Design an enzyme around this catalytic site. Structure first.
Site, PDB file in Angstrom:
ATOM      1  N   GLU A 134       0.840  -1.175   0.000  1.00 15.91           N
ATOM      2  CA  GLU A 134       0.000   0.000   0.000  1.00 15.91           C
ATOM      3  C   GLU A 134       0.894   1.251   0.000  1.00 15.91           C
ATOM      4  O   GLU A 134       2.131   1.160   0.155  1.00 15.91           O
ATOM      5  CB  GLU A 134      -0.852  -0.049   1.267  1.00 15.91           C
ATOM      6  CG  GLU A 134      -0.041   0.110   2.569  1.00 15.91           C
ATOM      7  CD  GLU A 134       0.947  -1.039   2.854  1.00 15.91           C
ATOM      8  OE1 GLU A 134       0.719  -2.162   2.348  1.00 15.91           O
ATOM      9  OE2 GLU A 134       1.972  -0.828   3.561  1.00 15.91           O
ATOM     10  N   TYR A 152       8.673   4.420  12.536  1.00 18.75           N
ATOM     11  CA  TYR A 152       7.320   4.224  12.003  1.00 18.75           C
ATOM     12  C   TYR A 152       6.283   4.978  12.837  1.00 18.75           C
ATOM     13  O   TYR A 152       5.375   5.601  12.280  1.00 18.75           O
ATOM     14  CB  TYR A 152       6.956   2.727  11.967  1.00 18.75           C
ATOM     15  CG  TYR A 152       7.169   2.042  10.609  1.00 18.75           C
ATOM     16  CD1 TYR A 152       8.444   1.829  10.088  1.00 18.75           C
ATOM     17  CD2 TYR A 152       6.077   1.607   9.854  1.00 18.75           C
ATOM     18  CE1 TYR A 152       8.628   1.196   8.824  1.00 18.75           C
ATOM     19  CE2 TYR A 152       6.243   0.974   8.631  1.00 18.75           C
ATOM     20  CZ  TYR A 152       7.516   0.771   8.118  1.00 18.75           C
ATOM     21  OH  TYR A 152       7.632   0.136   6.898  1.00 18.75           O
TER      22      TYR A 152
END
Ligand SMILES: CCCCC/C=C\C/C=C\CCCCCCCC(=O)O
Ligand SMILES: [K+]
Ligand SMILES: [K+]
Ligand code: NA
Ligand code: NA
Lengths: 579, 558
Positions: free
Chosen positions: B66, B184
């Site tokens: 994605e 992240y």
């Protein structure tokens, strides 16, 4: 419509919105907001050019109102627009490209920002010199805008604050007077926080190649003409008659005079009207080398049109707060002085430390004479500023922040002076021997043309609820307000070309249902890195622990510094040079 | 070079850099970082296409990940790439309009008990463990060199829905880089509202090759870029002169023949060091994928460079001694008819056959022994699918556990066996599983990828070479094992593009800003919003009160 940031929404092209083939636009005013409205209609709404009608007041150096302002890198909407506009000066490139490359080849900075004592550089030039007054700016930022409606700058700040270099730089470079909107000053402090490192030396500024008309307007005219946009000239719009049905507001008729003839344009809900309400240039008068510009507070077509709209609906704004009862002290006069030869060059080059004759940046923005009674500032852009200049000519801009004081040399208010007198007062402050001033300011050597602009300061008058109409008033079916007297729903700053382009984009995206994000105001006020950077620069590069502040705040800072030791937050403060 | 943000730098076109007409490029590896290097060389450096040589290992897997809206560099690139599917438009436009027409979201993220939605699905369920995330962000990166995720977090944290969502959606294993997990959490803070239901994610129309690679190939070929095939680069010989490092020779085998390319300082070499897809093997419906830890051309090349200079990284850190528990196996199951469709449709509450998004991203079976997750993209995922075919992706996070129904480790399973374990967890009656997983109904192909988890191995300073090593005159490292100077996150196509842009702009002197990592971690609005969503929307977790409310309202936080 919706707001966005980042490259994904920047680079994306919107789909053609539904229904636009049935629609037309009537743009009242051909200033930057109106031209930009036409650009967004052509490019993004995909409205047919021949369905766009720009209604223009006018018919089919020394010019002082073809002139403009600096820009900065975070004019997000304006750069969104100009990347699509072909450069006229650099074929094959966009206007953005021309400007970007120019800024790289000839970057802007000042070697001398503040002078006094007839030509000396102020010894503290470069320093903000705020001391504990910096806390005032912090306190202003932390005061909600809804708590300070109607308040003025001088009602909030200390006497001490107005004596700081910061206030000198700020008031002069932005044209803030002490009686102006506190909320707008707060908006500027938040909006331009990322440039606190670059205010005293103007490294934060960027400028067009030429005067605003030549550089910013002509490429827009060419682009719009090429897409078949219709320009109507000698149009004097007296009113837009608006129908009310329920909560809906529908522009129904444009009433105007054109070529001496009374005309009406009948509208449907599919005819979209964009009004530039108000003007800071309207009613300008002109003097010359030997004649003062006549003083006036006349209202022209723009102010009258806004009055006529305001009468029809309480959501259509209050023009009176911007155009009536401006103080005598207000900035009114700007002048261009054309140097006809090189005799005065050394008086400017000694300040800029640059040749006036190499086509590159000179003063880098205004130099302010801090002990001049008029608060006189002057700038020499990169030259030629007008393409019509001969190779020996240099154009200098001159402005006075105070219009109610007699000069140091010419004992008159600037509003009572000829162009030659304004030049003489300048030459006095540059250190030209008094015995030479009369001759050096005379027509063989200089030609100076003053303009009196009743409304040049009008964007900044204190505002209350309802004073500026929303860009798209609630319930408006086909009517928008654009320009720097319209109320964008954002916190953006007026007296900028960015705000003109923003209101155009918001009006078009809202009324034509363009499915792409409008950039939010660049979020530097929410970026912790910029908050910390600003506290370092504003204090003239003091560590946070060493900055002057009331003792409870100082204690709070010490406690907090202990709380975050050895953490990522401490790394952010070290990066900002605060610890 | 320099970093920027905002529209001025985004929209500006750089001037042609000096000296480029005398320069060429050798791009070793034709993954996305290599192709992106060639795009920036053509578009921004204005290097002649005929002087750009992409050395491709293959003569003559398909799957990607994605993306999100703040892939700043990748969107900078794709706005300049013509769409193949929507003539007249850029690839960015194709993708943007598709995302508006068929926005991604999941109606079922976690399941258990042979086909029930987990009752707390949608909640992070962190409780006080949320403080641990805050603690991690507040820990300087320099303090956690070499540390693993399980060294930092509590036992309780690993039982939270947050860890289930995070570990499975990003393929973070417990022994992976803590620093990368921290990166992240900081990088993607602006999407904390969108992780459990995947509303944060965006996807291509088709598989990664069809959607992302083909338009790049068309663009580069249209600009005259040279592709060299069946190239196996054995080394790049680098000279040292004072503090300078200069690539001097490329040593390679092409088409069965040994060759050398001699270089000058004007021949710029871009090496994609390491590979997560190298040495992959394939099984079929009736055959497990052959198991391996073989190093191939990419790993061997990085090793040969590492030998020549301590600034050239340490590949062994990433490619040796991977745990047996690591993710190794992915499979694609092709449904041949509609017999199993209700077992997926019951979960998604959506028709499988309307061309619009289905699972919206992976569904994780939380009580599967393999930690099995599966996704069904918008269909068809491959243009060659017949109208009745639906393609399902399947992965296992743990490779060392026996299945619940198929009592084998995934790495020992045929395609059919992986399908049977899945159908068991979907609630298919066991008497029907063998027939429903048979080839008339499902065809499932497993792939074993030895290095799929390699990007995330715990690292120390110097293990990844800088994109342009100090003193390097004509050599760059690109891709997700190179060290961008930023805080950007690997296992993303964004990082590939970023390294390409950094390498080109640095070595060719392109005078335009490279977008910094999108600064959402520094945006106080996002710090506040993240606190709100991470706590599952808790408040809980006088005059001045009123001014605080007015300020929050002014910043649209309330
Ligand atoms: C251009 C100036 C910008 C400098 C940085 C601006 C603001 C810094 C952010 C907030 C400071 C936190 C303390 C708030 C002070 C509250 C005092 C009060 O209760 O009134
Ligand atoms: K100059
Ligand atoms: K569907
Ligand atoms: Na700054
Ligand atoms: Na695009």
């Amino acid at each position: 419509m919706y707001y966005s940031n980042g490259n994904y929404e920047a680079f994306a092209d919107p789909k053609k919105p539904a229904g636009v083939d049935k629609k037309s636009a009537y743009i009242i005013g051909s200033g930057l907001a109106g031209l930009s409205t036409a650009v967004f209609l052509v490019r993004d709404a995909q409205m047919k050019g021949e369905n766009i009608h720009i209604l223009e007041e006018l018919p089919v150096a020394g010019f002082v109102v073809r002139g403009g302002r600096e820009m900065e890198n975070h004019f997000e909407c304006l750069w969104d627009m100009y990347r699509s506009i072909p450069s006229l000066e650099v074929p094959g490139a966009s206007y953005l490209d021309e400007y970007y490359w120019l800024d790289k080849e000839d970057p802007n900075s000042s070697n001398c920002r503040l002078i006094y004592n007839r030509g000396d550089r102020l010894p503290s030039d470069g320093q903000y010199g705020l001391g504990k007054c910096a806390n005032e700016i912090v306190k202003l930022i932390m005061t909600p805008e809804k708590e300070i409606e109607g308040q003025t700058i001088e009602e909030f700040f200390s006497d001490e604050f107005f004596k700081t270099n910061f206030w000198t730089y700020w008031s002069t470079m932005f044209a803030f007077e002490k009686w102006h909107s506190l909320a707008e000053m707060r908006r500027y402090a938040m909006r331009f926080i990322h440039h606190i490192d670059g205010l005293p030396d103007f490294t934060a500024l960027k400028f067009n190649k030429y005067n605003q008309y030549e550089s910013m307007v002509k490429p827009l005219l060419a682009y719009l003409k090429d897409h078949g946009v219709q320009f109507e000239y000698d149009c004097h719009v007296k009113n837009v008659e608006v129908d009310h049905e329920g909560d809906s507001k529908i522009a129904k008729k444009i009433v105007m005079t054109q070529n001496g003839k009374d005309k009406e344009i009948d509208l449907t809900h599919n005819d979209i009207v964009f009004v530039t309400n108000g003007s800071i240039t309207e009613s300008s008068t002109y003097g010359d080398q030997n004649t003062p510009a006549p003083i006036t507070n006349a209202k022209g077509d723009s102010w009258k049109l806004w009055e006529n709209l305001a009468k029809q609906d309480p959501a259509f704004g209050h023009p009176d707060v911007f155009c009536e009862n401006l103080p005598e002290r207000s900035w009114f006069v700007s002048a261009t002085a054309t140097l006809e030869n090189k005799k005065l060059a050394p008086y400017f080059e000694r300040l800029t430390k640059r040749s006036l004759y190499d086509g590159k940046v000179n003063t880098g923005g205004i130099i302010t004479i801090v002990d001049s009674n008029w608060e006189l500032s002057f700038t020499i852009h990169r030259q030629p500023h007008f393409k019509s200049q001969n190779p020996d000519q240099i154009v200098v801009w001159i402005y006075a922040l105070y219009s109610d004081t007699e000069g140091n040399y010419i004992k008159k208010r600037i509003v009572d002076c000829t162009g030659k007198e304004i030049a003489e007062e300048l030459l006095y402050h540059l250190g030209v021997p008094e015995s030479q001033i009369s001759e050096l300011a005379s027509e063989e050597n200089m030609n100076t043309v003053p303009v009196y602009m009743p409304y040049i300061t009008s964007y900044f008058m204190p505002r209350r609820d309802g004073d500026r109409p929303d860009v798209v008033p609630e319930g408006s079916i086909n009517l928008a307000f654009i320009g720097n007297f319209a109320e964008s729903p954002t916190r953006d700053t007026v007296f900028t070309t960015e705000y003109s382009v923003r209101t155009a984009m918001e009006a078009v995206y809202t009324l034509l249902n363009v499915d792409r994000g409008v950039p939010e105001v660049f979020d530097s006020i929410y970026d912790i890195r910029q908050l910390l950077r600003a506290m370092y620069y504003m204090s003239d590069k003091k560590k946070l622990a060493d900055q002057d502040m009331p003792l409870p705040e100082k204690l709070a800072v010490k406690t907090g510094m202990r709380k975050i030791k050895k953490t990522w937050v401490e790394e952010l403060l070290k990066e900002a040079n605060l610890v």
